[PDB]
Amino acid sequence: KPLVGTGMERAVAVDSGVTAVAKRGGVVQYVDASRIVIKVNEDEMYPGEAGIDIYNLTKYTRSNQNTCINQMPCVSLGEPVERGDVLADGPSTDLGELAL
Amino acid sequence: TEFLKPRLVDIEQVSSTHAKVTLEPLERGFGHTLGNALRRILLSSMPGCAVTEVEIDGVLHEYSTKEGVQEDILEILLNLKGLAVRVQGKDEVILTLNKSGIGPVTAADITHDGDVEIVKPQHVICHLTDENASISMRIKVQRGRGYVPASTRIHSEEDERPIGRLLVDACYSPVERIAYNVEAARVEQRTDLDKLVIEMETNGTIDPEEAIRRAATILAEQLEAFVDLR
Amino acid sequence: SVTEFLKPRLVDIEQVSSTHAKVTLEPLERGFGHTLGNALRRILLSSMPGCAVTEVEIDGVLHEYSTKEGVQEDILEILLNLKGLAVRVQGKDEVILTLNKSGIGPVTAADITHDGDVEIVKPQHVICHLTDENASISMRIKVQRGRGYVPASTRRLLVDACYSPVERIAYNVEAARVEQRTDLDKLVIEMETNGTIDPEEAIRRAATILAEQLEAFVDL
Amino acid sequence: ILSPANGEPIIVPSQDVVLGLYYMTRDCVNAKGEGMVLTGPKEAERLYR
Amino acid sequence: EIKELLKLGDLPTSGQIRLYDGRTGEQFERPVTVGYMYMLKLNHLVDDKM
């Protein structure tokens, strides 16, 4: 992260596509180095067979300038997350902050 | 003329890491000379021990992700760069590691090889997050003197490898920072004598007494090359 | 192979004058140029044993800002000439010398009375000039053992004292090569003494001083 | 050394050397060792070190 | 406000610290400015040009 930054890097790092954002709020149920499985809160379940969510993070692969796009988890196991919050730090991000 | 010689007084240690060592008798000018000379020699070249090669069961190449493990393999290598290991009688030791269960794999979980001891047993490596998770690796700790990157050793081998090895560049320097001061010494009927205070922070591997004696041994060898001039 | 290092295999001692010298050393470990250069530089400046002149008194004048007839120089000029008077002294600690001459011409260094063990190294050093045959100069000067360089402000006329027999040292660190290693230091000492000693011996005396400083830590 | 467009040296010392030489050769009316006396330039160097 | 935040820590107000020298061990005479600046690395790498 940068020490001296304007109050803007969170909206830039979220509103782009390089990070993964939880669509519904709930409890972290499984985190590997590759993927994140989230149990959904029961208030946010439409009543027909909602269940869980699965995010498959993108691993080491090619970008157009031959740099290495990467994703990593930033939540711990059994931790609560909320709708609209970050889960996967992409490239040059840090906890939902743009960090070049 | 008829000048004094230093001695070695009061090795205080504030913590496990950092000490300050005091040299009580000094002449007028020699405080800064010995302070800067020992600061340079201790920062540059000391015997250290660090991790060179890592082999993990079930990982072909680095840039992969073992299942169950929270970090990548790359972050496990960047964690094992920072491992404080004192080797007492050898030059290369193959430590092992085996762990299962949910929890952090801590460096205390290394199978105790005996003569090798671990300075800091609270250092984290990875975090296993599953019942059916099991990390099992073989770590190579080697003794060296400077700073050697990966590719120099890569083209120094040139002959063969198996695939599962990962090379990790070493960091053979046990000290981290050194600051010295020169203060007014107190020897009877005399006011123009000085005193060194050397404050050094290491990684916990090496005793400060041995450090100062070995630095003075190196400087003595260089000036023994000087004295016999032509 | 941890403990051993590269020890130097030197090239030359190129000397220009009988008191000018240049010494080269190669190769040294990467970063051992400046430690040895700084150590020898700071020892040869700040602390050497040497004999120099501390005080002078003129029989005619007992004040600094004054004058005397017959002298094309001044009292200030003749004190600056008496700083650079280079003398070696045998086992005494300090001793007075007297100077006395009448006549016209350059009063030089060999004019001074011999006084036994006291030996002047430069008998052609020009002290003052007398222009009148009636004018005659006579003075008292004190040589004294000392340990470096002392200004007059921390100090019968007070003279600056230059005990240290060096006059110039400057060191350089430049690239040198062992065929597979990339960068090793190469050290160049350049040095001027005053003439009380040849320049080669001053280096080995300073190195002897620093090894005897480390004597209480070499022991393993 | 001289330029073909006009007879002026093209080896003018640039910005950083200018700052160094300008900082060396100045004066200030009260400092260490003011008003003493010297033998050569090399004794002035030995006083600076 | 930068002055007061530097006053909350034990740092000097002027933003200038005495700095020593690695080679000689002497002192740099005037105080210099030290701080933490955030820097980038651009992709004009030398092993795409030589």
UniProtKB/Swiss-Prot annotation, chain C:
Catalyses which reaction(s): RNA(n) + a ribonucleoside 5'-triphosphate = RNA(n+1) + diphosphate
The keyword Kinase is assigned to this record: no
Catalytic EC class: transferase
GO cellular component, one term: DNA-directed RNA polymerase complex
Region described as Alpha N-terminal domain (alpha-NTD): 1-220
This enzyme's EC code(s): 2.7.7.6
GO terms under biological process: DNA-templated transcription
GO molecular function, one term: DNA-directed RNA polymerase activity
Superkingdom: Bacteria
Keywords: DNA-directed RNA polymerase, Nucleotidyltransferase, Transcription, Transferase
Similarity comment: Belongs to the RNA polymerase alpha chain family.
Functional description taken from the UniProt entry: DNA-dependent RNA polymerase catalyzes the transcription of DNA into RNA using the four ribonucleoside triphosphates as substrates.
Domain remarks: The N-terminal domain is essential for RNAP assembly and basal transcription, whereas the C-terminal domain is involved in interaction with transcriptional regulators and with upstream promoter elements.
Assembly mode: Homodimer. The RNAP catalytic core consists of 2 alpha, 1 beta, 1 beta' and 1 omega subunit. When a sigma factor is associated with the core the holoenzyme is formed, which can initiate transcription.
Name of protein: DNA-directed RNA polymerase subunit alpha
Organism for this UniProt entry: Escherichia coli O157:H7
From Swiss-Prot, chain D:
Highest taxon above the source species: Bacteria
Function: DNA-dependent RNA polymerase catalyzes the transcription of DNA into RNA using the four ribonucleoside triphosphates as substrates.
Family affiliation: Belongs to the RNA polymerase beta' chain family.
Subunit architecture: The RNAP catalytic core consists of 2 alpha, 1 beta, 1 beta' and 1 omega subunit. When a sigma factor is associated with the core the holoenzyme is formed, which can initiate transcription.
Protein name: DNA-directed RNA polymerase subunit beta'
Organism: Escherichia coli O157:H7
Whole sequence portion shown: 490 to 538 of 1407
From Swiss-Prot, chain E:
Sequence positions bearing N6-acetyllysine: K7
Family note: Belongs to the RNA polymerase beta chain family.
Subunit structure: The RNAP catalytic core consists of 2 alpha, 1 beta, 1 beta' and 1 omega subunit. When a sigma factor is associated with the core the holoenzyme is formed, which can initiate transcription.
General function of this protein: DNA-dependent RNA polymerase catalyzes the transcription of DNA into RNA using the four ribonucleoside triphosphates as substrates.
Protein name (record): DNA-directed RNA polymerase subunit beta
The organism of origin for this protein: Escherichia coli O157:H7
Full-sequence range covered: 1194 to 1243 of 1342
